[PDB]
Design a protein around this ligand. Structure first.
Ligand SMILES: CCCCCCCCCCCCCCCCCC(=O)OC[C@H](COP(=O)([O-])OCC(O)COP(=O)([O-])OC[C@@H](COC(=O)CCCCCCCCCCCCCCCCC)OC(=O)CCCCCCCCCCCCCCCCC)OC(=O)CCCCCCCCCCCCCCCCC
Ligand SMILES: CCCCCCCCCCCCCCCCCC(=O)OC[C@H](COP(=O)([O-])OCC(O)COP(=O)([O-])OC[C@@H](COC(=O)CCCCCCCCCCCCCCCCC)OC(=O)CCCCCCCCCCCCCCCCC)OC(=O)CCCCCCCCCCCCCCCCC
Ligand SMILES: CCCCCCCCCCCCCCCCCC(=O)OC[C@H](COP(=O)([O-])OCC(O)COP(=O)([O-])OC[C@@H](COC(=O)CCCCCCCCCCCCCCCCC)OC(=O)CCCCCCCCCCCCCCCCC)OC(=O)CCCCCCCCCCCCCCCCC
Ligand SMILES: CCCCCCCCCCCCCCCCCC(=O)OC[C@H](COP(=O)([O-])OCC(O)COP(=O)([O-])OC[C@@H](COC(=O)CCCCCCCCCCCCCCCCC)OC(=O)CCCCCCCCCCCCCCCCC)OC(=O)CCCCCCCCCCCCCCCCC
Ligand SMILES: CCCCCCCCCCCCCCCCC[C@@H](O)O[C@H](CO[C@H](O)CCCCCCCCCCCCCCC)COP(=O)(O)OCC[N+](C)(C)C
Ligand SMILES: CCCCCCCCCCCCCCCCC[C@@H](O)O[C@H](CO[C@H](O)CCCCCCCCCCCCCCC)COP(=O)(O)OCC[N+](C)(C)C
Ligand SMILES: CCCCCCCCCCCCCCCCC[C@@H](O)O[C@H](CO[C@H](O)CCCCCCCCCCCCCCC)COP(=O)(O)OCC[N+](C)(C)C
Ligand SMILES: CCCCCCCC/C=C\CCCCCCCC(=O)OC[C@H](COP(=O)(O)OCCN)OC(=O)CCCCCCC/C=C\CCCCCCCC
Lengths: 98, 122, 115, 55, 140, 49, 175, 44, 347
C-alpha cells in the first residue's frame, strides 16, 4: 500500500493514543476523538475514490454527520461537568469506584 | 459455530415452516404441556403472593389466564422444537446416505473371536 | 498547481509586509508601553480566567445544524435524477425535520441566552 | 494439630485467603479514567502484537 | 509472542541446558515486563525513578524464576536420563517457587509457590505429552 | 370498615373480569381447533386416514 | 516519484495530528486540527474528491470555532500550555515526530510489514485508473445518489439529527 | 433458649463502602443515602 | 424529563439495537450503534446528580472509543476487500480490532472497568436497561462474525471476565456493583462458547436476561441499593426476600434451578470440541459468584437483621405500582430446567 495510506493509519493511531493517554483537560480528549473521526473520513474517502465505488461517495458525509452528534454529545457532557466543578478536569470524575 | 441458520430454502422469520405440518402434532395431554401449565399456575400464585392477596383463592380468572397463556405458548414451542429435531435427523440420515465412504459398514466379530485382556481383582 | 502558487504568493506578500512593519521603524519598547490596556489602569485579574458563555446551547445546536448543510449541498445534482418524486420527498423530509428541530428548541426556551 | 490447624490451613483457609487477596487487588481501583484508558492502550497493543501477529 | 515459546520448545528436553535456561529467562522477562506495565498503568508510582525501580524489580523477579525453572528442569532431565517425565517440570517449578519466595523474602510464599508452580509445570508437561488443548479449535 | 375510596369495592371490575375470561376461552377454543386441524393435516400428508 | 506533493501533505497531516494529540491548551490543539483538516482537504482534492475535501474542511472549521468558544468558557487556566512550556507535552510531540520519521524511513528505504502489510513507495500516481470519459463528476453523482438510492440513510440520519437536538436539550437541563 | 440472630455489631460488618477494608480503602466512604452529593463551593 | 421525551428516547435506543440486528451493511450497523449511544446517554442522566453525570461521561467515552475502533476495523476490511456485507472479516488485523471494539462495548475484561462505576452511578431502572438491553447488539454482531474470530483472544477475554467478575464481586457491599460484576462474569461465560456454538450463546443470553430482570425488579420493589438497606426487607415484605433468595440461588447455577442450564449446556458443548481444562476452570471460578450471592442471601433472607422503629409506619401502606411481568420473570428464572430440549428452537 502507498505511503499515504500508512500516513493516514498512523494519524488514526496517534489520535487513538492521544485519547487513551489522558491529561487534565477533557476538551483535549474530545479533540483527539474528533481527530480520529477526521482520519477515518480521509481514509474511507481515499479508498472509495481509488476503487471508483460510486455509491459510497455518500458514506463519508454520513460519517461526518454522526461525528457531529458525538461532538455535540461530548460538549453537552462537558458543560455539566464544568457546572459541577468549575473545571473540565478528568480528576474530578472520581466519585465512582470499581 | 452457526449450524442451521444458513440451511437452504429457509424462510427468515416463519417460526413454523410448511413442511413442519408433516409431523404428528403434540398431544394436548403432553407432559411438557402439563409442566407449562404448572409453570403458569406457579406464576399466578406468585402474582397473588407479591400483591398480598390470598394466594390460592384471589384471582381465579387471573390464574386461569396465566395457565392458558403458558399452555398456548408451550404448544407452539413444542411444535417448533420437534420440527427442529426432525430436521436434524433428516439431514444426518441424508448426509450418511450421500457419503458411504465416510461411514463404512465393517464386518463385526463375535466375542468368542475377539481377544480381550483379563485383569484379575486381587 | 496554480492555486498553490497563488496561496504562496499571498502568504509571502503578507509576511513581507509584517517584516517591513517590524524592521523599518524605530523601536523604543519599555514595560510601561507594553503593558495590557484597560483604559487607564492595571487589570484586576487575568484575561485567561474563564469567560462564561451564555449562548452555549445555541453553539451546540449550531454543530448539528452545520451538518444539515452537508446533507443539502448535493441538491443541485440530485435534481438531475430520473426519479424526481423520490428525491423531492426525501429533500423535503430532511428540511421538515430541520424545521421541527428548530421549532422544538424554540418552544423549549433553548434559543434564550442563559441569565 | 491435624483437624483444627493443618487440614484447615491447606485446603479451605488457603483458598479463602487467596480469593480475598485477589478480590482486594481487583476491586481497589480509584475510579480515575486516566489509569483505565492507559491500561486499555496496553491491552490494545498486546492484542495487536501477541494475537494479531500469529495467524 | 509464541515465537519465544517455540524458541524454548524447539530445543529438546535434556539437551543444551544453557540455551533452555536463556529461552526461559526471556519468557519470564517478557511476562515481568507486561506485569510491570499493567501495574504502572493502574497504580502510578508517583515518581519516574520509582516506576523504573518497580519495573526492574518485577522483571528481574520473573526472569530469575524463568532461568531457575529452565536450568533446573533441563539439568534434572539430563542427569536422570528421563526426558518426557513430568517430575523434571515439577522440580523446576518448585525451584522457581522457592526463588520467588526468596525474592519476596517470605517462607510461606516460598513453600506455597514451590508446591503450586511445581504442580502447574508437571501438569503442563502432561498436557504436552498427551496433547491437551487449552484453546481448542472448533472441530464440531 | 375502611375509611377511603379503596378502588376495589364489594363489586369486582366486571369489564376486566369479562375480558380476562373471554381471552382465556378464546385461546382455549383456538388451541383446540388448531390441534384438530394439525392432526387432520398430518394424517392427510402421511396417508394414515 | 511525482514531486511527492501528496506525501508532503500526508506528512503534514500526521504532524498536525501529533500537534493536537500531545494535548497542549485546546487553543493550540484546535489550531492543529484546523491545519490537519486543511491538508486533508488538499489530500482528497489531489485524488479527485473536491466536494468531500471542501465539505470536511468547512465542517471542521465550524466545529473548531465552537470548540474555541467552549475552551474560552470552560478549558482555560492561568498559563495555557504550548508545545515547549511543558516537559510532558514536548516529550509527546518529539516522540510522535521521531516515530513518524522512523516509519517513513523504514518504509521508503526498504520494504517492511509495519503492522498490517508492506510498502515500497512508487508514489501515489501508480494506483490511478486512467479512465477517459464523462460530462460529469463521478463523486458528485455518487453523493447526489443519496436522494434516490439512499432513502434509508436519509431517514436514519434525519432521525438521528432530530434526536440529537432533543438529547442536547435534555442533558444540559440540569435540575 | 432462642435461636441466634444478627445484632448491630454483626450488621455493621456490611455497612462499609467495601468488604475487607485495607489501609487505603478504609478512607473510602459509603455513598449518600440518596444518590446526591453535596454541592461544592467552587465559586466562579 | 417529560414522559413523551422519555418514551421517544427509549424507542430510539430500541431502534438503534434493531437497526444493528437487521442490517446487512457495516455502515448501517455502525449507525445503529451511534443512534443507540446517542439516545442512551440522556436515559442514564434522567435523575440528575453529579454521580449520574460522571457515569454518563465515562460511558460515553468508553462507547465512543469503541465506535472509533469499530469504524476503523470496517474501513480496513473494506480496504483489503471491497466488501460492506457483514459475513466474515477478510483481514486478521481488522478482525482483531473489531473483536476488541465489541469487547469494549460489552465490557469484557480487560475493558470491564467502566461497568461497575456506571452501574453504581445510575438509577436501578437505568441499570436494568444497561445490563439487559445494551448487550443484544454487540452479541448479535459477534454471532454474525463468529467463524472469523480468533479463538485464543476471545477465550482469553472470556476467562479473564469470569475471573475478574468473581473476584470483584467478592468485595462489594453495594448491590449495583454486585450486579455489574455478575454481568461481567456472565458475559465471559457467553463469549467463551461463541466460537463453537452461537445457539448456546443465545440461550445463555436469554437465561441471564431473565434472571437479571427478576433481580432488578425485585430490587426496585424493595427500594434497596445496599446490603444493609436490603436487610430491612424481611421485616416489611418477607415474600420478596424469599423470592430474591431463590433467584440468587438460581444465578449461582445450582441445580435443579434454571441458572444451571446454560453452564451445563456450555461445558458439554466445549467437551464436543476437546476442551476440558477451560470448562473445568470456568465452573470452578463461577464458584466465586455463587459465594457472594450466598453472602447476600445470608444477609437478606436466611437470617433476620435488626430493624428500625419507623418501619412500623411502612407496615400500613401497600406498593402503589405493580410489576406485571415480575411473577413470570421469577418463574422463568427458577423453574425451566425440565424444558431444556426446547433450546433446539433457538437454532
Ligand atoms: C411454586 C408454587 C407456589 C408459588 C407461590 C407461593 C407463594 C407463597 O407465599 O405461598 C404462601 C401460601 C400460603 O399463604 P396464606 O395461606 O395465604 O397465609 C400467609 C400467612 O398469613 C403468612 O404468610 P407470609 O407471606 O406473611 O410469610 C412470609 C413467608 C413467605 O415465604 C414463602 O412463602 C416462600 C416462597 C418462595 O416467608 C417467611 O416466612 C420467611 C422464611 C424464610 C425461609 C427461606 C426459604 C424460602 C424458599 C423456599 C421455597 C420452596 C419452594 C416453594 C414451597 C411452597 C411455598 C408455598 O402458600 C400456599 O398455600 C400455596 C402453595 C400451593 C397450594 C396450592 C396447591 C394446589 C391445591 C391442591 C390441589 C392438588 C393438586 C393436584 C390435584 C389432584 C386431584 C386430587
Ligand atoms: C508460563 C509462561 C508465561 C506465563 C504467563 C501467565 C502467568 C503470569 C503470572 C503473573 C501474574 C501477575 C499478577 C500476580 C502478582 C501480583 C501483582 C504484583 O504486582 O505483585 C508483585 C509481587 C510483589 O509486588 P509488591 O510491590 O509487593 O505489591 C504489593 C501489592 O500486593 C500489589 O500491588 P496492588 O495490590 O496495589 O495492585 C497491583 C495492580 C497491578 O496488577 C498487575 O500487576 C497486572 C497483572 C497482569 C498479569 C498478566 C501478565 C501475563 C502476560 C503473559 C504474556 C506472555 C508473554 C510471553 O493490581 C491490579 O490492579 C489488578 C486489577 C485487575 C486488572 C485486570 C486486567 C489487567 C490485565 C489482565 C491480564 C493481562 C491481559 C494481557 C492480554 C489481554 C488481551 C486479551 O511479587 C512480584 O514482584 C512478582 C511479579 C510477577 C512475578 C510472576 C512470575 C512469572 C514467572 C514466569 C516464569 C516462566 C518460565 C518459562 C517456562 C516456559
Ligand atoms: C492501531 C492501534 C494502535 C494504537 C496505538 C499506536 C500509537 C502510535 C503513536 C505514538 C506516539 C505518541 C504521540 C502522542 C501521545 C500522547 C501521550 C500523552 O499525551 O501523555 C499524557 C501522559 C499524562 O500527561 P500528564 O498528566 O500531564 O503528566 C503527568 C506526569 O507525566 C506523571 O506524573 P507522576 O510523577 O505523578 O508519575 C510518575 C511517572 C512514572 O513513570 C513511569 O513509571 C514509567 C517508567 C517505566 C520504566 C520502563 C522500564 C525501562 C526499560 C523498558 C524497555 C522494554 C525493553 C527492555 C527489555 C529488557 C531490558 C534489559 O509518570 C507516570 O506515572 C506515567 C505512567 C505511564 C508511562 C507510559 C505509559 C505506557 C504504558 C505503561 C508502561 C510503562 C513502561 C513499563 C515497561 C513496559 C515495556 C516498556 O503523559 C505520560 O504519561 C508520560 C509522557 C508520555 C509521552 C510519551 C508517549 C509516547 C508513547 C505512545 C505509545 C508507545 C508506542 C505505541 C506502539 C508502538 C509499537 C507498535
Ligand atoms: C490428610 C491427612 C493429614 C495430612 C495434612 C496435614 C499435614 C500437612 C501439612 C503439615 C505441615 C507442612 C507445611 C509445609 C511448610 C510450611 C512452611 C510455612 O508455614 O511457612 C510460614 C512460616 C512463616 O515464616 P515467616 O513469617 O516468613 O518468618 C518467621 C519464621 O518463623 C522465622 O523462621 P526461623 O528464623 O526460625 O528459621 C527458618 C529456617 C530454619 O528453620 C528453623 O529455625 C528450624 C529448622 C527447620 C528445618 C528442619 C530440618 C531438620 C529435620 C527434617 C528432617 C528431613 C525431612 C524428613 C525426612 C524423613 C526421613 C525418613 O527455615 C529454613 O531455612 C528451612 C529451609 C528448607 C529446609 C526444610 C525443607 C525440607 C522439605 C521436606 C522435603 C521432603 C521430601 C520428601 C521425603 C520423602 C521420603 C520420606 O514459615 C515458618 O516459620 C516455617 C519454617 C520451616 C519450613 C520447613 C518446614 C517444612 C517441613 C517439611 C514440609 C513438607 C510437607 C509438605 C509436603 C508437600 C509440599 C510439596
Ligand atoms: C427463562 C426461559 C427463556 C424465556 C425467554 C422469553 C420467553 C418469551 C418470548 C416470546 C415468544 C415469541 C418469540 C418468537 C415468536 C415469533 C417470531 C419467530 O418467527 O422468530 C423465529 C425465531 O424463533 C424464536 O427463536 C423462538 C423463541 C423460543 C425461545 C424458547 C427457548 C428456551 C430454551 C429452553 C428453556 C424453556 C423455556 C420455557 C418457555 C416459557 C425466526 O427464526 P430466525 O429469524 O431464523 O432466527 C433468528 C436468529 N438466527 C437466524 C441467528 C438463528
Ligand atoms: C511590499 C513587500 C515587498 C517589498 C520588497 C522589499 C522587501 C524588504 C524586506 C524587509 C526588510 C526591510 C526593512 C528596512 C530596514 C532594514 C532592517 C535591517 O535589515 O537592517 C539592519 C540590519 O543590520 C544588522 O542588525 C547588522 C548588520 C550586519 C549583520 C550581518 C548579516 C550579513 C551582512 C554581511 C555584510 C557583507 C556585505 C553584504 C552585501 C553584499 C537592522 O538594524 P537594527 O538596529 O537591529 O533594527 C532597526 C532598523 N532601523 C535602524 C532601520 C530602525
Ligand atoms: C413494517 C412496519 C411499518 C411501520 C413502521 C416503520 C418503521 C421505520 C420507518 C419507515 C420505514 C422505511 C422503509 C422503506 C425504505 C425506503 C426505500 C424503498 O421504500 O423505496 C424508496 C421509496 O421512497 C419513498 O419516497 C418512501 C420514503 C418516504 C418515507 C419518509 C417519511 C416516513 C418516515 C417516518 C419514520 C422515520 C422516523 C420519524 C421521522 C419524522 C425509493 O424507491 P425508488 O426511488 O422508487 O427506487 C429505488 C431503486 N432505484 C434507485 C434503482 C431507482
Ligand atoms: C484460580 C482461582 C479459582 C477460584 C476457585 C474458588 C474456589 C471456591 C471457594 C471460593 C470461596 C471464596 C470465599 C472467600 O474467599 O471469602 C473470604 C471471606 C471474607 O469474609 P466474608 O465472607 O466476606 O464475611 C466476613 C467478613 N466481613 O473469608 C471467610 O470468611 C471464609 C469463610 C468461608 C470459607 C469457605 C470456603 C470453603 C472452600 C472449601 C475448599 C474448596 C475450595 C474450592 C477449590 C477446591 C480446590 C481445587
Amino acid at each position: 500500500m502507498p505511503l499515504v495510506y500508512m500516513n493516514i493509519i498512523m494519524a488514526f493511531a496517534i489520535a487513538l493514543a492521544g485519547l487513551l493517554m489522558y491529561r487534565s483537560h477533557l476538551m483535549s480528549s474530545l479533540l483527539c476523538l474528533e481527530g480520529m473521526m477526521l482520519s477515518l473520513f480521509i481514509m474511507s474517502t481515499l479508498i472509495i475514490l481509488n476503487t471508483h465505488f460510486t455509491l459510497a461517495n455518500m458514506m463519508p458525509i454520513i460519517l461526518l454527520v454522526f461525528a457531529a452528534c458525538e461532538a455535540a454529545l461530548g460538549l453537552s457532557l462537558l458543560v455539566m461537568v464544568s457546572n459541577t466543578y468549575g473545571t473540565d478536569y478528568v480528576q474530578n470524575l472520581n466519585l465512582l469506584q470499581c | 459455530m452457526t449450524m442451521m441458520s444458513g440451511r437452504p430454502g429457509r424462510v427468515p422469520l416463519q417460526f413454523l415452516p410448511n413442511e413442519a405440518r408433516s409431523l404428528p402434532p403434540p398431544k394436548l395431554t403432553d407432559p411438557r404441556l402439563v409442566y407449562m401449565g404448572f409453570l403458569g399456575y406457579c406464576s399466578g400464585l406468585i402474582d397473588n403472593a407479591i400483591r398480598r392477596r390470598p394466594v390460592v383463592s384471589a384471582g381465579l380468572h387471573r390464574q386461569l389466564l396465566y395457565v392458558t397463556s403458558f399452555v398456548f405458548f408451550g404448544y407452539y414451542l413444542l411444535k417448533r422444537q420437534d420440527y427442529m429435531y426432525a430436521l436434524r435427523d433428516h439431514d444426518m440420515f441424508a448426509y450418511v446416505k450421500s457419503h458411504p465412504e465416510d461411514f463404512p459398514e465393517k464386518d463385526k466379530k463375535t466375542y468368542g473371536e475377539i481377544l480381550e485382556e483379563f485383569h484379575p481383582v486381587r | 498547481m496554480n492555486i498553490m502558487l497563488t496561496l504562496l504568493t499571498n502568504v509571502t506578500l503578507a509576511s513581507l509586509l509584517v517584516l517591513i512593519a517590524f524592521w523599518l521603524p524605530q523601536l523604543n519598547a519599555y514595560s510601561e508601553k507594553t503593558s495590557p490596556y484597560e483604559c487607564g489602569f492595571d487589570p484586576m485579574g487575568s484575561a485567561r480566567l474563564p469567560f462564561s458563555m451564555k449562548f452555549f446551547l445555541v453553539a451546540i445546536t449550531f454543530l448539528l445544524f452545520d451538518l444539515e448543510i452537508a446533507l443539502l449541498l448535493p441538491l443541485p445534482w440530485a435534481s438531475q435524477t430520473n426519479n424526481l418524486k423520490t428525491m423531492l420527498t426525501m429533500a423535503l423530509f430532511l428540511l421538515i425535520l430541520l424545521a421541527a428541530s428548530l421549532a422544538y428548541e424554540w418552544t423549549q426556551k433553548g434559543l434564550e441566552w442563559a441569565e | 494439630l491435624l483437624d483444627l490447624i493443618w487440614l484447615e490451613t491447606i485446603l479451605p483457609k488457603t483458598t479463602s485467603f487467596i480469593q480475598m487477596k485477589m478480590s482486594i487487588m481487583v476491586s481497589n481501583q480509584k475510579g480515575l479514567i486516566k489509569l483505565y484508558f492507559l491500561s486499555f492502550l496496553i491491552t490494545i497493543m498486546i492484542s495487536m502484537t501477541l494475537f494479531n501477529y500469529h495467524e | 509472542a509464541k515465537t519465544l515459546l517455540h524458541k524454548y520448545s524447539d530445543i529438546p528436553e535434556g539437551t543444551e541446558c544453557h540455551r533452555k535456561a536463556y529461552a526461559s529467562t526471556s519468557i519470564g522477562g517478557a511476562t515481568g515486563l507486561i506485569v510491570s506495565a499493567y501495574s504502572i498503568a493502574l497504580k502510578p508510582p508517583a515518581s519516574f525513578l520509582e516506576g523504573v525501580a518497580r519495573t526492574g524489580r518485577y522483571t528481574f523477579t520473573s526472569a530469575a524464576i524463568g532461568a531457575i525453572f529452565g536450568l533446573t528442569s533441563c539439568i534434572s532431565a539430563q542427569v536422570r536420563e528421563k526426558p518426557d517425565d513430568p517430575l523434571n517440570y515439577f522440580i523446576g517449578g518448585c525451584a522457581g517457587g522457592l526463588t520467588l519466595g526468596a525474592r519476596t523474602r517470605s517462607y510461606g510464599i516460598g513453600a506455597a509457590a514451590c508446591a503450586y508452580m511445581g504442580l502447574t509445570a508437571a501438569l503442563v508437561k502432561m498436557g504436552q505429552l498427551e496433547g491437551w488443548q487449552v484453546f481448542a479449535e472448533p472441530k464440531v | 370498615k375502611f375509611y377511603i375510596r379503596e378502588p376495589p369495592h364489594g363489586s369486582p371490575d366486571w369489564l376486566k373480569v369479562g375480558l380476562t375470561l373471554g381471552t382465556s376461552v378464546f385461546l382455549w377454543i383456538y388451541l383446540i381447533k388448531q390441534h384438530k386441524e394439525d392432526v387432520l393435516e398430518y394424517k392427510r400428508r402421511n396417508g394414515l386416514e | 516519484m511525482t514531486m511527492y506533493i501528496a506525501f508532503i501533505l500526508s506528512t503534514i497531516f500526521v504532524i498536525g495530528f501529533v500537534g493536537f494529540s500531545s494535548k497542549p491548551s485546546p487553543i493550540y490543539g484546535g489550531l492543529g486540527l484546523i491545519v490537519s483538516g486543511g491538508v486533508g482537504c488538499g489530500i482528497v482534492l489531489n485524488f479527485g474528491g473536491s466536494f468531500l475535501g471542501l465539505m470536511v474542511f468547512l465542517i471542521y472549521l465550524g466545529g473548531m470555532l465552537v470548540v474555541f468558544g467552549y475552551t474560552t468558557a470552560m478549558a482555560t487556566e492561568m498559563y495555557p500550555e504550548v508545545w515547549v512550556s511543558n516537559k510532558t507535552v514536548f516529550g509527546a510531540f518529539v516522540s510522535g515526530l521521531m516515530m513518524e520519521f522512523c516509519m517513513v524511513y523504514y518504509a521508503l528505504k526498504e520494504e517492511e510489514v509495519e503492522i498490517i502489510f508492506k510498502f515500497n513507495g512508487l508514489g501515489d500516481w501508480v494506483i490511478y485508473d486512467t479512465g477517459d470519459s464523462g460530462f460529469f463528476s463521478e463523486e458528485a453523482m455518487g453523493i447526489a445518489a443519496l436522494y434516490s438510492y439512499g432513502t434509508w440513510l436519509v431517514i436514519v440520519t434525519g432521525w438521528s439529527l432530530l434526536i440529537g437536538v432533543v438529547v442536547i436539550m435534555e442533558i444540559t437541563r440540569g435540575n | 433458649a432462642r435461636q441466634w440472630q444478627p445484632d448491630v455489631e454483626w450488621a455493621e460488618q456490611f455497612g462499609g463502602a467495601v468488604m475487607y477494608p485495607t489501609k487505603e480503602t478504609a478512607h473510602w466512604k459509603p455513598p449518600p443515602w440518596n444518590d446526591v452529593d453535596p454541592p461544592k463551593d467552587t465559586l466562579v | 424529563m417529560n414522559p413523551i421525551i422519555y418514551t421517544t428516547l427509549i424507542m430510539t435506543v430500541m431502534s438503534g439495537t434493531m437497526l444493528v440486528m437487521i442490517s446487512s451493511h457495516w455502515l448501517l450497523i455502525w449507525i445503529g450503534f451511534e443512534m443507540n449511544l446517542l439516545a442512551m446517554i440522556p436515559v442514564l442522566m434522567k435523575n440528575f446528580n453529579p454521580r449520574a453525570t460522571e457515569a454518563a461521561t465515562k460511558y460515553f467515552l468508553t462507547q465512543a472509543t469503541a465506535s472509533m475502533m469499530l469504524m476503523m476495523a470496517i474501513i480496513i476490511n473494506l480496504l483489503y476487500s471491497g466488501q460492506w456485507t457483514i459475513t466474515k472479516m477478510f483481514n486478521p488485523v481488522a478482525m482483531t480490532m473489531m473483536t476488541m471494539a465489541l469487547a469494549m462495548k460489552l465490557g469484557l475484561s480487560p475493558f470491564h472497568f467502566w461497568v461497575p462505576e456506571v452501574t453504581q452511578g445510575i438509577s436501578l431502572q437505568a441499570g436494568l436497561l444497561l445490563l439487559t438491553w445494551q448487550k443484544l447488539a454487540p452479541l448479535s454482531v459477534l454471532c454474525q462474525i463468529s467463524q472469523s474470530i480468533n479463538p485464543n483472544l476471545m477465550l482469553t477475554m472470556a476467562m479473564l471476565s469470569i475471573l475478574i467478575g468473581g473476584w470483584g464481586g467478592l468485595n462489594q457491599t453495594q448491590l449495583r456493583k454486585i450486579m455489574a460484576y455478575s454481568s461481567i462474569a456472565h458475559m465471559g461465560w457467553m463469549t467463551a462458547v461463541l466460537p463453537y456454538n452461537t445457539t448456546m450463546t443465545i440461550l445463555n443470553l436469554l437465561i441471564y436476561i431473565t434472571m437479571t430482570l427478576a433481580m432488578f425488579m425485585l430490587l426496585i420493589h424493595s427500594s434497596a441499593t445496599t446490603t444493609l438497606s436490603l436487610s430491612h426487607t424481611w421485616n416489611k415484605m418477607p415474600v420478596i426476600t424469599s423470592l430474591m433468595m431463590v433467584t440468587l440461588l438460581s444465578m449461582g447455577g445450582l441445580p435443579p434451578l434454571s441458572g444451571f442450564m446454560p453452564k451445563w449446556m456450555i461445558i458439554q458443548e466445549m467437551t464436543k470440541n476437546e476442551s476440558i481444562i477451560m470448562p473445568t476452570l470456568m465452573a470452578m471460578t463461577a464458584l466465586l459468584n455463587l459465594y457472594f450471592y450466598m453472602r447476600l442471601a445470608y444477609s437478606s433472607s436466611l437470617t433476620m437483621f435488626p430493624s428500625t422503629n419507623n418501619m412500623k409506619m411502612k407496615w400500613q401502606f401497600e406498593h402503589t405500582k405493580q410489576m406485571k411481568l415480575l411473577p413470570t420473570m421469577i418463574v422463568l428464572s427458577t423453574l425451566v430446567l425440565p424444558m431444556t430440549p426446547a433450546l433446539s428452537s433457538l437454532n
